[PDB]
Design a protein around this ligand. Structure first.
Ligand SMILES: NC(=O)c1ccc[n+]([C@@H]2O[C@H](COP(=O)([O-])OP(=O)(O)OC[C@H]3O[C@@H](n4cnc5c(N)ncnc54)[C@H](O)[C@@H]3O)[C@@H](O)[C@H]2O)c1
Ligand SMILES: NC(=O)c1ccc[n+]([C@@H]2O[C@H](COP(=O)([O-])OP(=O)(O)OC[C@H]3O[C@@H](n4cnc5c(N)ncnc54)[C@H](O)[C@@H]3O)[C@@H](O)[C@H]2O)c1
Ligand SMILES: NC(=O)c1ccc[n+]([C@@H]2O[C@H](COP(=O)([O-])OP(=O)(O)OC[C@H]3O[C@@H](n4cnc5c(N)ncnc54)[C@H](O)[C@@H]3O)[C@@H](O)[C@H]2O)c1
Ligand SMILES: NC(=O)c1ccc[n+]([C@@H]2O[C@H](COP(=O)([O-])OP(=O)(O)OC[C@H]3O[C@@H](n4cnc5c(N)ncnc54)[C@H](O)[C@@H]3O)[C@@H](O)[C@H]2O)c1
Ligand SMILES: Nc1ncnc2c1ncn2[C@@H]1O[C@H](CO)[C@@H](O)[C@H]1O
Ligand SMILES: Nc1ncnc2c1ncn2[C@@H]1O[C@H](CO)[C@@H](O)[C@H]1O
Ligand SMILES: Nc1ncnc2c1ncn2[C@@H]1O[C@H](CO)[C@@H](O)[C@H]1O
Ligand SMILES: Nc1ncnc2c1ncn2[C@@H]1O[C@H](CO)[C@@H](O)[C@H]1O
Ligand SMILES: [Cl-]
Ligand SMILES: [Cl-]
Ligand SMILES: [Cl-]
Ligand SMILES: [Cl-]
Ligand SMILES: [Rb+]
Ligand SMILES: [Rb+]
Ligand SMILES: [Rb+]
Ligand SMILES: [Rb+]
Ligand SMILES: [Rb+]
Ligand SMILES: [Rb+]
Ligand SMILES: [Rb+]
Ligand SMILES: [Rb+]
Ligand SMILES: [Rb+]
Ligand SMILES: [Rb+]
Lengths: 417, 417, 413, 413
């Protein structure tokens, strides 16, 4: 009925879940309304998320709303075993997630999740939805809709749409303003460095840190690396973010040129093989590589393993690969999302807004069942904006409002001298 | 045939125009192609722009393209008289612009510009287009299309559209990525502080600087104020930018609360009466107010003039208003765009991209004459992106490109474990 | 002969210790020379330090020099049990330090250390040196010199001197340029935020963080707090650093004013009761307080415990005090050094320079026995400067040198 | 008796001078007391300063104190002609300074100044003091004391001392905390970028800016360059500041390596020929070079003029040197202090503290006549500290003070 490491961890999990809730007031307000209105009565739901204290708070909100949920891990290394135990023991929510599970177990958990015959699927990376569409065409009648948490998953869903197989509504949670403006940027910025520091306790100041990608995540990682005293190099494939990085004070160059200069490399591109053997070959002795994109394939670790003569664990979450010429490359978190693998992921303050979008996106799918076209849907503007209003209020920040006279001016095109 | 301060200033103007061109290579490339292809042969054009060295380089590019142009000032205080002289004397381009001209002269220049019967109108603030639509309905057959440089003008054009009177194509230059991502942000950031410093030589470090608005301009002004050692307060009307400002490290509060704390106030909202008598009344003795939004109406200077018992000029571009209770309020640039009134406006590096958009937007209007719907048009993505590619190249910055294998991964929705 | 938690944790300690050595290249060379020259032959030593991977690497250097060393914890919560086990087990260095040891056990270890009859005492807070002066006047015959690692220890030594009881050479390690320009500033800046984040995983961006003190540590904490997106308030008692903080972009104000605004309070003053009952009473519901200065007494936790009707642990290293009106005050690390209590302390890069100073200051005391005047002695400038040169080289950074004509120009007027 | 450009510019000078006074509150109070006590009664004085609105406010303070003052320019390009006219016309203070005066005229003014037989000399670069020692040995009978405003002047005085010719009291104004912690750092940081921008209106964001020297000025310039979006490289000759720059996030390297990367070079070293012919030869086409340290000799412009086949003025304060291969080198301010040559120098806020030091250092020299030992004397700590207190108060910032028990805790060990 579940598959977890150790249910005796539930008390620790409960404590950390309650602490996380302190900065998730928006989701708390949503949970209390769900508790009354039960939008998910009779709905079966699968969530493929990072099994964290923040995901637990989302699961509790969906549970209050009546959802018959089943949670599986989005990544083998991000699972928090105490959280899994608490969800099973305290809430009776089936969880199939073991920190460190092998790929066979991960894939079996996806099969178990699809056997739940979900009506709603919350995905983080689109693994489950892709598996649904590829292997479970006979189940598609169950689907009211799905949601997608992260940028990599949105890219996959776009490919599904262009391939003609996205035959149901999918909510683009990642691209909501109150999601990727804060989660992807400020959350990833802090928690990526957190993971690197918990793994290595390395001094960031004075180090050359290479950030691959200058999108929402790259901007955050570079900003916080800079804030911690690092010399920051940015790599890119598109000129607009490249000019931005330069005018933000960072050096921009091709990865081949960055490869011999970086002390720490951090990939946040969403793309495959951004760091390759031709790069490993020129890296400093002891260069550190890690990834905060969704999938570890941003770094060609398979080639690194094949080239290296020895690999050994030298600290928690930290492996030293020794190359035939004696130089070493350090890898954190086995190349998996370093903030979640070596630390705890984003602080709950930003996950409050991301998972408020998840909850209200699920509600949107059910309230509009039978009225949404197949394909990708953006979060409604009014929902996006109300999440922002509520979060600003809960942060204790007050701002101004337009007067009628100011509205009159906006609408009066004739005036201006 | 023109109306300028002093044509003997042309040699100084020529020198400053040539210097500005050094960081406008993208526009230079466009000018050389226009010189060959003459896209504006037989076209009459009016430009209502800030009469700066950067605008002169745009005017020279349009002139090379065959445009029969006429230039008027977008603001009485932004005109550079040496630039006006050089355009008339060296290029024979009619200019109607005198730094410090009164409102009657400004309005007469708009009338002269409309009497040119332009086919294309480049506007900065939409004064000329609004006057065209309100007073010159009988001329609309001349119009191939117009362009708009700034955010205030886009807002006016939206009101014209909603009012049913935008009956021709208008290119939204401001909202091109290569325009407001750099011009509005990094350009305004540097040149606003430049104007304040040229006006007052005040030490920015240790001062509390209140930035009204956290859009593209507000982000830039806050970023550079912070970079110069100021304590930064941000005011807003919308929660998304408000949360952003907080997570960027700034204090966010209503203007009423900021009013008693700020040493320098900078308005960049695009809206009317953001600083009002109720704010003046609680400001520190010697508080400085200035505006970098397009129109000075962001500050209620009319009420300040009526309240004050004395006003006197205390330094270039700097007025001291003494209130009946003896406290003083300092105003820079008479509330007109402070970067252009008290300094030289944006550096040419960013105007290279803004005015490349202007030139290519004008070309777009002519090449597509008879095929564009009335209403607002965005800059085509391929044009926007090519400007970015060329600017990055001219900045000497190299970046990466996706491999076929990386493209295959983007398109393969099934893979990911 | 040792008092540790679990000797079976030694492999993990050695793992983390060698990892830490990777960015201790300067101390490596000093230890390499020590094993060749054995400065500390027949010299017994006590170290009262934080029991960390970096302190271990220092102890390994003194051992390499022939030192007969004994290590005790400087703070019951900073001790790393795997490091204590590795030292006892892989090097034969007696360690008396157990993470979370009570007050009795702490001073029982200080009594064991002085029963070692140390010739050299390395101190971090002036705790053992102050006990030696107080209770072991008969043992002063054995002291060649002592060293002090922290600002608070330097302040107490100055009072010992002014009191007329600093009757031996004391090396001011903290005030060496290569120590507190970097350790106190860059080290404390990063590792203090590290401790807060490991304790709470709180988002720092958008929070108001109040930093009490703008000395070396305060500058570092404020700089990194700001770098992580916080609105930073600085409190002070001296005008020069107060003006600096304002010109660095921070809001300077009295603590009574900061108390109603701060989301997180960090004390780095070296002084007693900087956060007081009258501040708790006006703090925001859920305000976090922690200390990175000395001991814990920077926060008046005794008064907080009296104002509060309930206290509970709510996360690792994190206590929630609930006041009668229902508002809470969060305390991290029981008011002890938050970087060492909730995390691992400074990265080894900065401790490389701090502990190279320690190792050479110990070398100085020994090589100048019976030649040192009583009182405090600063690190020699050449030593301080050589550490910087070695570190800069180890970091792979090259700089310029004056040409003969540039020298000739400095001399003419 | 005066040598200025145009006495009719005086109203504009007085306008700008009083504006500058608004953020010179500390100097205001000192001048207020001076007019009451007249410390400089019967005392003749020379000032060799930059002829700015802030220097004017200093001269007005010495005049208020009874000073018989004469002012000459410290740099032919820093002189503000309207300020010179206002001083002559509104206060009767002889000024010998003309913006853009040639070399002959400069030293003709230095000869006029010493013919004033000054009892006090305020110097900015040690120019007049070095001429007094060289040529006016007979006038040393008149010297009560002198003062020096800049690091370069301090270095030359040290050589005068070591040479055995500093036979009078010299006040080290530059090294007072309230002077170079702020003026040299925050003042130079802003006003150097101000000069570059007024000269060129170049976008600083996205440029690589090379800062030669990481002392007080270099830290300030690098900090603000970075704040304005530049990629900052720092060069150095000393390891301690080099490590600081790296830990502050800047790229540290030899100038030979920086020369091929920099878009803008800023020298703040105090030393000769820091940018040399072998650097010009590898610079990017259009690289900008300027100096904010001393004199101009930090950049080897003599060699540049020889490498170049042509030079032309291309904007105010801006020259383009074109080399035989067609590449250009841009020089701002003819290599003179770019903040003062192309802009207005430091804002008066920082000069408030620098010139309060000057005014009180002059008070010190006079009130201790015949009591000062020959050589350099630092600003008394109480004076330095009182300036900070007054400034902090004037800025509207309040801070804390220790309670009696907190004091009692500092003293116990
Ligand atoms: N670890 C976390 O907690 C977390 C949180 C949010 C998102 N993410 C992941 O981070 C990744 C990036 O997300 P985002 O929102 O920043 O995406 P984004 O689309 O906003 O930006 C990605 C950027 O990377 C650039 N890029 C692409 N390929 C590149 C290459 N080969 N080299 C250099 N730059 C390249 C793109 O041009 C773009 O600017 C995704 O995989 C996303 O799922 C992780
Ligand atoms: N001076 C320059 O050289 C220059 C350059 C570009 C744009 N501009 C002008 O700057 C202004 C702002 O442009 P932008 O591109 O940043 O626009 P924007 O739409 O990106 O942002 C404006 C911001 O102001 C906020 N705002 C609106 N009314 C407000 C109020 N009453 N109080 C506080 N915040 C308020 C909005 O919520 C928004 O976030 C416009 O007038 C534009 O034309 C000036
Ligand atoms: N946690 C760590 O790892 C670590 C490392 C090094 C030092 N420290 C400790 O941190 C403390 C500070 O060290 P430092 O080097 O910054 O000292 P410092 O002497 O350089 O600076 C202390 C500053 O605090 C100010 N101050 C004193 N009392 C104050 C009060 N009541 N309110 C506000 N400001 C006050 C002083 O004016 C001074 O500017 C010391 O106890 C030192 O031992 C901790
Ligand atoms: N422009 C202004 O308004 C202004 C104001 C104050 C001081 N200054 C001048 O600026 C200069 C620097 O003053 P400061 O207070 O920063 O001095 P400082 O002594 O504090 O720092 C100078 C730094 O330059 C470094 N240095 C010396 N020679 C070098 C070289 N060849 N290459 C690289 N680095 C080198 C030194 O190691 C030192 O760290 C002096 O000439 C001073 O008079 C100018
Ligand atoms: N603390 C966390 N809890 C749950 N999901 C997280 C956490 N941190 C990051 N994520 C999510 O994981 C996604 C990447 O797989 C990001 O889009 C982000 O929303
Ligand atoms: N240097 C300049 N030359 C011409 N136009 C400018 C300059 N600086 C700012 N502007 C423009 O003025 C507009 C505001 O009226 C901005 O959108 C910007 O594009
Ligand atoms: N990782 C660490 N190992 C040992 N001592 C440390 C560590 N981090 C900080 N310290 C020291 O602890 C002292 C504070 O008590 C500081 O002087 C500092 O040098
Ligand atoms: N505005 C100014 N007025 C007078 N002196 C100045 C000004 N700006 C900088 N200086 C001084 O010039 C010296 C550099 O020669 C510095 O010591 C600094 O104090
Ligand atoms: Cl709700
Ligand atoms: Cl082209
Ligand atoms: Cl050695
Ligand atoms: Cl006084
Ligand atoms: Rb995990
Ligand atoms: Rb292998
Ligand atoms: Rb309007
Ligand atoms: Rb102008
Ligand atoms: Rb009036
Ligand atoms: Rb894929
Ligand atoms: Rb610990
Ligand atoms: Rb000299
Ligand atoms: Rb000047
Ligand atoms: Rb004490």
């Amino acid at each position: 009925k579940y598959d977890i490491k150790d249910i005796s961890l539930a008390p620790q999990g409960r404590q950390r879940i309650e602490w996380a809730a302190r900065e998730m007031p928006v989701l708390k307000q949503i949970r209390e309304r769900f508790a009354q209105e039960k939008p998910f009565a009779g709905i079966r739901l699968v969530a493929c998320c990072h099994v964290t204290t923040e995901t637990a708070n989302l699961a509790i909100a969906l549970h209050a709303g009546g959802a018959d949920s089943l949670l599986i891990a989005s990544n083998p290394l991000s699972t928090q075993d105490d959280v899994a135990a608490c969800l099973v023991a305290d809430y009776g929510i089936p969880v199939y997630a073991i920190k460190g599970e092998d790929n066979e177990t991960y894939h079996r958990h996806v099969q178990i999740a699809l056997d739940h015959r979900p009506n709603i699927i919350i995905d983080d990376g689109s693994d489950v939805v892709a598996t649904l569409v590829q292997e479970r065409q006979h189940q598609l009648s169950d689907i009211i809709g799905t949601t997608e948490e992260t940028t990599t998953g949105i890219v996959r869903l776009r490919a599904m749409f262009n391939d003609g197989v996205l035959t149901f509504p999918a909510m683009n949670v990642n691209d909501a303003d109150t999601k990727h403006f804060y989660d992807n940027r400020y959350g990833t910025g802090q928690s990526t460095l957190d993971g690197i520091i918990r793994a290595t306790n390395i001094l960031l100041a004075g180090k050359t840190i290479v950030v691959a990608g200058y999108g929402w995540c790259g901007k955050g990682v570079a900003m916080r690396a800079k804030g911690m005293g690092a010399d920051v190099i940015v790599t890119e494939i598109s000129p607009v973010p490249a000019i931005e990085a330069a005018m933000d004070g960072f050096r921009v160059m091709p990865m081949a040129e960055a490869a011999h200069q970086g002390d720490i490399f951090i990939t946040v591109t969403g793309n495959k093989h951004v760091i390759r053997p031709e790069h490993f070959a020129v890296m400093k002795d002891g260069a550190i590589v890690c990834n905060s994109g969704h999938f570890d394939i941003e770094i060609d670790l398979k080639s690194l393993k094949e080239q290296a003569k020895e690999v050994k664990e030298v600290r928690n979450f930290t492996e030293q690969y020794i190359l035939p010429n004696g130089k070493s490359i350090i890898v954190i978190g086995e190349g998996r999302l370093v903030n979640l693998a070596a630390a705890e992921g984003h602080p709950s303050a930003v996950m409050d807004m991301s998972f408020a979008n998840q909850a209200l996106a699920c509600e949107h799918l059910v309230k509009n069942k039978g009225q949404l076209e197949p394909g990708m849907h953006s979060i409604p503007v009014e929902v996006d904006q109300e999440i922002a209003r509520l979060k600003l209020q809960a942060m204790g920040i007050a701002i101004d409002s337009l007067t009628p006279e100011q509205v009159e001016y906006i609408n009066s095109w004739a005036s201006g001298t």
